[PDB]
Amino acid sequence: VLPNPGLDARIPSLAELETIEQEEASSRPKWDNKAQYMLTCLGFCVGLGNVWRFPYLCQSHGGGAFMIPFLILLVLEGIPLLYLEFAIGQRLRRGSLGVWSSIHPALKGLGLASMLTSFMVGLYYNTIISWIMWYLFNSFQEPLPWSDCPLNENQTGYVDECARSSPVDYFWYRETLNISTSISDSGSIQWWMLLCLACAWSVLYMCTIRGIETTGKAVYITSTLPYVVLTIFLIRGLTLKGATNGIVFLFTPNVTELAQPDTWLDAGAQVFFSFSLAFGGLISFSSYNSVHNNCEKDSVIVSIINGFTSVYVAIVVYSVIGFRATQRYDDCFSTNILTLINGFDLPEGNVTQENFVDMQQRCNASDPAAYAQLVFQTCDINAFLSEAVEGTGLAFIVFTEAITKMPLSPLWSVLFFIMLFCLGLSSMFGNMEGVVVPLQDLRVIPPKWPKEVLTGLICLGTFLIGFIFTLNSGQYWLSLLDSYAGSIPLLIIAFCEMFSVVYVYGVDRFNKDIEFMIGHKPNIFWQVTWRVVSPLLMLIIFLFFFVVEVSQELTYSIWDPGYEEFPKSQKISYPNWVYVVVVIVAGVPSLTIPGYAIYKLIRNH
């Protein structure tokens, strides 16, 4: 609809497409088997980002409360943009940057941002992989290292932290992070974190050495194993004392959380992380298919699987949350019972859940003075369920603690980390795809050098950038990318990708060119979303981000051993200078789309 001049001779034609495959068999990587393509998409869309952030987002807000908006926007906003990314990659036969520049030179900024966003999300994920494989390396010892504390200085008690906090808390915060007091208090490159980060980058380079002719062989173990281990954890998780309590807790969603703006804001941003939309990987992966591949079927299958896996993962994360919560509740009562049995010298087994409160007052009447001198913890179980996990805490504290309770603790622990490592590595394949290819298509390195040279330079580059997440304050540093800053650019790109393919390339052209490939011209559902419904939701929700998430003071939970209520999150405001850091990483890609366009409209004229 916008006044585009000479779009053709800048992109492939429809009559030429018949010679983009057999004629162009070389010069472009091609999926050996549709299976190999489907596993990559399944891996990429249903990896970390769909299986890591989702439960954390659901544990926060409300259990079932946050699930409703997510599944509304998953189809009303995610399915459209996923179909639009697959079809345009399959039609124009080029990667992200190439596709946007083909539609319009100014759109190059869209691909540039997509490359930066993909880089940053890989940098983030890699660290999570490094922590996963730290934990995976320690889980080959019958008594797992986070099931106890180091003896006191006089080998008497244990570290005040470990004593006042949990063994799992001490293994995470002290033995793994050696975390400092503040983001301001920068630490040192904890050598063992650096060493695991090196292992992470090393394995990823090995699996992505030679583009897609090395990752497609990897996704045979990397997109299957994670789903054949998450159905066993489901069974194990369901087979847990009090598991069915947390499961119901998840399906009991206060409706007043569904009527809060941030809840849905954290759902929309989450849609574009669940499906790796606006990283640009998907466009490239769909461009190596047959020109006559049914991409509508692929988008719907990927979306259904991606939607259904989100709920399957919150049913495994809650079974464990209700297991731990039930245990705490039981411990609270046991302790209470013991306290009253002590002093009063009640016969052991006399007082029980069945007769606590009546024997509280009874014994009170018998001897109030003594009963008065008796602390009594409050046990609720629902309050235990309501307890919200800290960032990354759920996987390295909640799950780790539950595993220790599980029999043959080392078997499960190992399996739990091998699942998280595999669905991380899978996710990283797409993340790396979306930074290698743009960098090839800028023609930045002399094209005599092989593909392996360029893939190692970015592995080492991002490896060197990842030293900041290896300091004492690194965890705080990593929790900044869990702020709105991370989602700021994604929303801009996704909207621009939709607007460019509908009001620049032309939806009419798109409808014809889609009809040429799959056979039929897309349904009314696809028309009503792409034209108005999809753009409106995306645009309105970014405006909401500007109004809620963006309009919030930056604060972060600090782990202060020397702090009143040490075993309690200390929420403090970020120092002003970290606004500079959020201005760049929210504003570099987001202003790249406008700011390369203006460059192309002041050089031409």
């Binding site: 390396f137 080959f140 060493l195 292992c199 394995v203 090995m206 092989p450």
Partner: peptide, 29 residues
């Protein structure tokens, strides 16, 4: 350190694989 020896073995095998693949690439040349 058991964790440390596990780390060592894993990194060794991974670098061996990296070398094998760079060679596979040399063969492809």
């Amino acid at each position: 350190s058991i964790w440390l020896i596990v780390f060592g073995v894993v990194m060794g095998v991974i670098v061996v694989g990296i070398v094998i693949l760079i060679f596979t690439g040399i063969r492809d040349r």
